[PDB]
Amino acid sequence: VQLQQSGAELVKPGASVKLSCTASGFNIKDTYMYWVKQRPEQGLEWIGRIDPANGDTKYDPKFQGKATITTDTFSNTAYLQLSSLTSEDTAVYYCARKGLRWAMDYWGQGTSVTVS
Amino acid sequence: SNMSLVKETVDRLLKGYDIRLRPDFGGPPVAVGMNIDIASIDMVSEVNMDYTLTMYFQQAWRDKRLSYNVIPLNLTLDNRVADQLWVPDTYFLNDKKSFVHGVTVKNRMIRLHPDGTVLYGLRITTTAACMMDLRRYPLDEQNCTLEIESYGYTTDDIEFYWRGDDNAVTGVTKIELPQFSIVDYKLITKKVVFSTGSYPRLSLSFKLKRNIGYFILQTYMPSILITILSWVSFWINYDASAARVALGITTVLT
Amino acid sequence: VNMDYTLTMYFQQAWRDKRLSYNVIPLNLTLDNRVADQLWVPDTYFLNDKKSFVHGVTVKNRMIRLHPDGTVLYGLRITTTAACMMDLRRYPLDEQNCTLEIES
Amino acid sequence: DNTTVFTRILDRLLDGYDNRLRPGLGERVTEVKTDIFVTSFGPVSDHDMEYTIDVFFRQSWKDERLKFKGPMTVLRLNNLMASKIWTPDTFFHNGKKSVAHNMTMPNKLLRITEDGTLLYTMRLTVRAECPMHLEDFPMDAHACPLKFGSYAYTRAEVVYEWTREPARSVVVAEDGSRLNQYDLLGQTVDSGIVQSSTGEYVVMTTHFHLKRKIGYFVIQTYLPCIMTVILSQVSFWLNRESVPARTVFGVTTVLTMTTLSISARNSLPKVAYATAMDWFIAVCYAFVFSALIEFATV
Amino acid sequence: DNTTVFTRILDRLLDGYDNRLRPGLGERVTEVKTDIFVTSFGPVSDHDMEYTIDVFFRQSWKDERLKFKGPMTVLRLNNLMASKIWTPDTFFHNGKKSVAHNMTMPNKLLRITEDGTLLYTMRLTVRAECPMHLEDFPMDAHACPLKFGSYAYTRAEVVYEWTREPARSVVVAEDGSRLNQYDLLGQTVDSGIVQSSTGEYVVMTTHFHLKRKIGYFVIQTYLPCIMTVILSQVSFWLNRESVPARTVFGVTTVLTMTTLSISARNSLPKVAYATAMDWFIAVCYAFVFSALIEFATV
Amino acid sequence: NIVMTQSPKSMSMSVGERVTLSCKASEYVGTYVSWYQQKPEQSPKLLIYGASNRYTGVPDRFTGSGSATDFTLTIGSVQAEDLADYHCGQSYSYPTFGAGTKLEL
Amino acid sequence: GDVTVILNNLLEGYDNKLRPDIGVKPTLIHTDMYVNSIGPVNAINMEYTIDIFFAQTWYDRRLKFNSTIKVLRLNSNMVGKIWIPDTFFRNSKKADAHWITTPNRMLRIWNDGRVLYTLRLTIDAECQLQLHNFPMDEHSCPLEFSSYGYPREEIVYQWKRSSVEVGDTRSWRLYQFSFVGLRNTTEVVKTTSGDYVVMSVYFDLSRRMGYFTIQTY
Ligand SMILES: *[C@@H]1O[C@H](CO)[C@@H](O[C@@H]2O[C@H](CO)[C@@H](O[C@@H]3O[C@H](CO[C@H]4O[C@H](CO[C@H]5O[C@H](CO)[C@@H](O)[C@H](O)[C@@H]5O[C@H]5O[C@H](CO)[C@@H](O)[C@H](O)[C@@H]5O)[C@@H](O)[C@H](O[C@H]5O[C@H](CO)[C@@H](O)[C@H](O)[C@@H]5O)[C@@H]4O)[C@@H](O)[C@H](O[C@H]4O[C@H](CO)[C@@H](O)[C@H](O)[C@@H]4O[C@H]4O[C@H](CO)[C@@H](O)[C@H](O)[C@@H]4O[C@H]4O[C@H](CO)[C@@H](O)[C@H](O)[C@@H]4O)[C@@H]3O)[C@H](O)[C@H]2NC(C)=O)[C@H](O)[C@H]1NC(C)=O
Ligand SMILES: *[C@@H]1O[C@H](CO)[C@@H](O[C@@H]2O[C@H](CO)[C@@H](O[C@@H]3O[C@H](CO)[C@@H](O)[C@H](O)[C@@H]3O)[C@H](O)[C@H]2NC(C)=O)[C@H](O)[C@H]1NC(C)=O
Ligand SMILES: *[C@@H]1O[C@H](CO)[C@@H](O[C@@H]2O[C@H](CO)[C@@H](O[C@@H]3O[C@H](CO)[C@@H](O)[C@H](O)[C@@H]3O)[C@H](O)[C@H]2NC(C)=O)[C@H](O)[C@H]1NC(C)=O
Ligand SMILES: *[C@@H]1O[C@H](CO)[C@@H](O[C@@H]2O[C@H](CO)[C@@H](O)[C@H](O)[C@H]2NC(C)=O)[C@H](O)[C@H]1NC(C)=O
Ligand SMILES: CCc1c(C(=O)OC)ncc2[nH]c3cc(OC)c(OC)cc3c12
Ligand SMILES: CCc1c(C(=O)OC)ncc2[nH]c3cc(OC)c(OC)cc3c12
Ligand SMILES: CCc1c(C(=O)OC)ncc2[nH]c3cc(OC)c(OC)cc3c12
Ligand SMILES: *[C@@H]1O[C@H](CO)[C@@H](O)[C@H](O)[C@H]1NC(C)=O
Ligand SMILES: *[C@@H]1O[C@H](CO)[C@@H](O)[C@H](O)[C@H]1NC(C)=O
């Protein structure tokens, strides 16, 4: 019913950071969590997804190795971890649900990542 | 809450339910309406004098014992509940062998309605006997039928009828046979008298016209070509006895 | 044509079950085959069989035999039409290799 | 409420009822009245010496234990009631593989009359063996039998009788006849007793009288033989000088006759003795051979 | 003792459970997640227009009535537990005849997670009808479909979905392919809705793309036709005097051509339209006829 | 892996005119296409799931037309509050999105 | 009322999972057979068909009823309550009982506890044929049966003196061959599970060359 994503953050270049996507109104174990990145004024880009029931994850070839996605089934949240951040990674990251023919019915408010 | 209420209602209906007695056991005949959705017709063979057709056979009657007035929605039940209700003993007089599909479960359906109506579906494949007249073969039209009848209940107990007279049977036009064309079909209602009584009957009949192209290419053309060889024999000179005789013999052998 | 072969066999299985151990009877009692429906038996199956049955005359050709330590024997007479995809390039000078996969 | 009376009646009938014991097990013989309505006389397969037949098999007896009083004289019941009461265990002596139809529900009916009389009808297909003497093939007639009686009850316990006059007890529907190359002239019934190592049993017999149709054998076998023989004598009218023409006539005719013999022999089942058609083929073969020998002599 | 806690848990699950009611029969929709693993893609029968296939049909849904807490998180129960709980009644819309394999025991597995999730797998063989257009025979490709849905549960009650990405939800085993004269290029899945008299249902569709192999037919028909045409040509170079030899060429070519034309047609079912093979045979027959016509002219 | 091309990259009209958006898939995606609209300073919202099914809480103005590879979204009688981007995405395989279409005036 | 009481008393405290004299001595069974007809003897599969009534007799101490009735003549309903030997035919490709109009089974329990149980069978048995020197060949196709789960220490079979009885033989479906006669035998065969008493019946058949003669020679 709602995905409460982390707040805005600022990170210096070359570091690593992690983002949270808390979920309410349902159990993440029943669906797949998605992570989508939208650089300003460009189309959405799919990062990866996780199957919380058994932790299986698949990543976009571009982001392979760069990102790691994990789920805290007990706390009912999914995590995205970006490493070796550069100046082209500054964008808005979204957390998305799945349902009804794999449509990403629900989305988070979006989290902003800024690299100096 | 609905789950508990539905469970209570279902247990209440089947409690003290006598499956041995038809609806209105001592009253007037119960009416049963039948739909059929032909799904395919296959193997129209002359060797065995039969044909095979798959269909969704549906029946609908009213059982006042099953009426409920506390759950305002028609409820569908697991097909196994059909073993605890009374259902009519319909049978196909002219079938040879048939079965109800059983994967992944028995392809059967039970659907109650608040007023008491019961809807009962089955997916049936049956090999029905069709005695064919081959005098005009392969330029002949055949009339194959399905003979639906009640076995143990006479017209005093049960009465059949097509539900939606013209629209009772659907899917005939979509049927495609390799060497046949479904010219038309007809739905007939009548009664048949045996030594034990008179029973309701329904007949579904198809008129099939055989396509001739296959036979034209297979049998008729080669023979006409063979007669050409005999005329070629007429052309050859009289002296060459061996050649002409060989031509004639080869024609006969072919 | 069908790329299959048929075979009849006496299929037997042996496993140990603590719950079926007895010590007051010093013999390996054999029970009527209908008791197999009240015990646990493994769900073995043949992966590459097209159709198979257990012979049933005069009764289901099936065996049960307990032992004092708990061991259970379970026999069956089966006829199975297993699939065997053949290479016919060297036909009729060919050698075939037909299997029967037994799995849980 | 309205039907609770019938439920009470049906519960009274069954309580304290033993279906392992036949009616009148103490002081009489259960008489069972049989009656057959043949809805279709299926095809005859001479290769297997068997024929198929669909019937309504009707049986009626009296059971003292199923008497009742109620608003209805006859109880037209569901066929699952028949598994609770005693029913005769008839079987077909010469049956090979019968099937009791089960679509869409069991094809059985049971009716109880207030006086205790039961009518038990069932629909079933029988594959029965019909011994055949093919000496006159294809001009042959047969009497295919159908015997039945009680398994497990001897003549001192269960006896069988025809419901109506024995001449009118087996009835064949007018529309229903799936014979291709045969004709059903009529049927005759009979009854008897058979001695066995396990007792004496009553055996009920029926004969279906068949006559073969010859047209197919005419067209396929005899007409080609006649034509080939005619060709063989046509060979004579050629000039003696044209040796190759006469030679090929002779060879081809002899060969056609050989191939027709092997073809005609395959239709009927393998049998040691010889059939009429076999004699005809043999004589036509002899004529062709003699014609060729005559040409060689010339 | 150690087995008694699990017996208590299982007894607690089943008591007060009605397998006649689907999960969430009042408010929500039972969402069944499906999946297929094809252990072998069986032979394709063009004469009957059907193909066989062996699968591990997997279905998963959620049932809140089967939540438990105990020493283990997942229960791996026998295949007789699945008969006590409610399970979806899936069926194959275009199937002709299927078997749920039963040797040595029913080939089914049921697994219950502590949150109420169920995994229900079963091994079965399907014969599905595959319409074929044979105009381009034997240079033809087909898409043989496999459609399944629910019997008696409309879209408002039961909805199906693929377990994984739809592109990865139908897996074909690498070593399982029993195709003799065909090649399996790939498969595609689609999910739609079908309208019927009883209601509106969900259908899961799968297409298996097949391409026929022409190797057999090239040796079987095409080369023989070419060689017959060449032999028919050979007649031109023969000397004009030897009339019988050229007549023999003509007769034997026409006879073998008729035999080949008959043989070719039996490879495929009776169809009014003419296949490419038929056109090739007709053109070669026309070439033989033209050779004879040129003979007559000269 | 599967490329989704949205055309036109931008287009505009006055209130009430019929407007159609076209998205085409490089490979086969069998009705597993979705349409989202992203208002400025907002997350995407699902509009059409499946080829044509209309998501709950969506006006009947929007309608989707499906195919194997050629998909279109039509907004009959565009109002003055439909001034957001529009993204087509396919879920037949690992999800991908189109470049988006901008709608103005 | 009397027979109902007798049948009720017999079945109270009766375990049909346990053979009679389970821990005491082997059960002796006197098998008997009536040959209704011997079907075609094909060669493409080296098998033949036979149709028989198979009868078995044994003694069950648990079924001794004391009364004025000499015998209880019962139908197939009671077969599933009492212990029944698990006899199968070792060399049968396929077999089946008959179930029309009702199971062709019989059961008769005598006063002294003797039980007679018969049933109607149709068996396809495999008899390897010496395909040298045919159609001049002559064979003897066997029929073998034994218990499936009971070794020699538990179930013992024994032919009677006049066990195998044949019918008229005129209507039999033997075309190529003819029924010369029969024999019988009993032995002990060692299997993985144990040693079993195997019974055999041999049917001696002489060939007729008429059909192949006419067809080919
Ligand atoms: C994989 O799955 C397969 C598919 O499910 C499965 O095969 C099935 O196996 C089961 C169990 O092995 C079979 O069920 C048994 O069937 C026996 C008869 O088998 C023959 O007949 C059936 C059809 O049976 C009908 O007809 C008989 C006789 O007429 C009736 O007795 C039946 O009840 C039934 O009746 C109905 O159907 C008719 C239409 O057909 C209707 O007209 C009628 O009105 C009824 O509605 C055939 O299908 C069989 O063919 C298959 O098997 C052969 C085997 O060689 C194969 O070659 C062939 O290819 C087919 O595969 C076969 O021809 C029954 O005798 C048996 O029931 C008795 O035993 C059980 C177990 O104890 C009892 O629970 C049951 O009650 C019966 O006992 C009573 O009856 C006997 C008399 O027979 C008494 O002696 C006994 O004392 C007892 O009496 C008591 O109870 C009575 C209540 O019944 C009561 O009246 C009495 O008063 C008394 O109190 C059992 O049902 C099933 O048929 C198989 N089906 C198929 C398709 O194979 C396979 O095994 C699985 N594999 C594995 C490895 O798991
Ligand atoms: C295929 O064969 C069947 C069987 O003969 C044909 O059915 C027959 O149809 C005619 C006309 O539809 C029926 O005759 C009608 O009978 C009613 C009885 O009330 C009468 O009122 C009408 O005036 C008319 O005479 C006839 O009864 C019926 N046959 C049977 C056995 O019931 C059918 O027409 C054939 N063709 C097709 C395409 O089905
Ligand atoms: C012929 O058709 C009838 C009716 O269509 C079949 O009768 C049905 O048989 C099934 C299976 O034997 C019965 O289900 C059983 O129910 C009992 C509880 O009563 C349960 O313990 C069993 O596990 C099984 O589920 C069903 O009740 C019964 N229905 C009726 C109305 O009799 C019959 O089996 C068919 N015969 C053949 C050979 O298919
Ligand atoms: C069937 O088997 C029985 C028992 O093995 C045979 O019975 C023997 O018959 C002969 C008569 O030729 C007697 O001299 C023996 O004393 C009998 N033996 C017993 C133990 O009683 C019988 O001969 C066999 N029938 C055959 C082989 O056709
Ligand atoms: C004699 C064979 C036999 C056997 C048996 O196994 O004897 C070895 N058992 C039970 C039997 N019931 C029969 C009923 C009959 O007719 C209605 C019948 O007709 C000749 C024979 C038998 C029969
Ligand atoms: C020309 C006679 C002939 C010959 C032959 O070689 O004789 C010279 N061979 C085989 C044959 N099969 C036939 C089938 C027929 O009916 C459909 C038929 O009808 C007149 C004639 C034949 C026939
Ligand atoms: C042309 C000869 C021929 C004839 C005939 O008699 O036509 C005149 N009939 C049938 C035939 N099947 C063949 C298969 C072959 O190998 C693939 C082959 O070799 C290339 C030749 C033939 C063949
Ligand atoms: C049940 O089905 C009937 C006929 O399909 C329909 O008229 C009725 O509205 C349905 N009931 C509910 C509650 O949807
Ligand atoms: C019981 O069976 C075992 C199986 O190995 C065997 O060794 C043992 O001798 C048997 N006992 C008796 C008393 O036959």
Residue numbers in the entry:
A (entry chain J): 2 to 117
B (entry chain C): 7 to 260
C (entry chain A): 53 to 156
D (entry chain D), E (entry chain B): 10 to 307
F (entry chain I): 1 to 105
G (entry chain E): 25 to 241
The authors write:
We took a strategy like that for the zolpidem complex to obtain the cryo-EM structure of the GABAA receptor in complex with GABA plus DMCM at 2.9 Å overall resolution. This dataset revealed three DMCM binding sites in total, one in the ECD and two in the TMD. At the extracellular benzodiazepine site, we were able to precisely position the ligand due to its remarkably clear density. Its roughly planar structure sits parallel to Loop C, with its dimethoxy head facing the principal (α subunit) side and its ester tail pointing to the complementary (γ subunit) side. The molecule’s β-carboline core is sandwiched between two aromatic residues α1-Y210 and γ2-F77, forming π-stacking interactions. In addition, the twin methoxy groups of DMCM are positioned to form hydrogen bonds (3.1 Å and 2.8 Å) with the α1-H102 indole nitrogen. In the TMD, DMCM binds in the inter-subunit β2-M3 and α1-M1 interface, with its β-carboline ring system sandwiched between β2-F289 and α1-P233 and its methoxy groups orienting away from the channel axis. The pore conformations in the zolpidem and DMCM complex structures are in a non-conducting, desensitized state, with a closed hydrophobic gate at the base of the pore at the level of the −2' side chains. Given the DMCM concentration used for the EM sample preparation, the ligand binds at both ECD and TMD sites, functioning as a positive modulator through the TMD and potentiating the GABA response. More precisely, DMCM binding was associated with an expansion of the ECD radius across all five subunits relative to the structure with GABA alone.
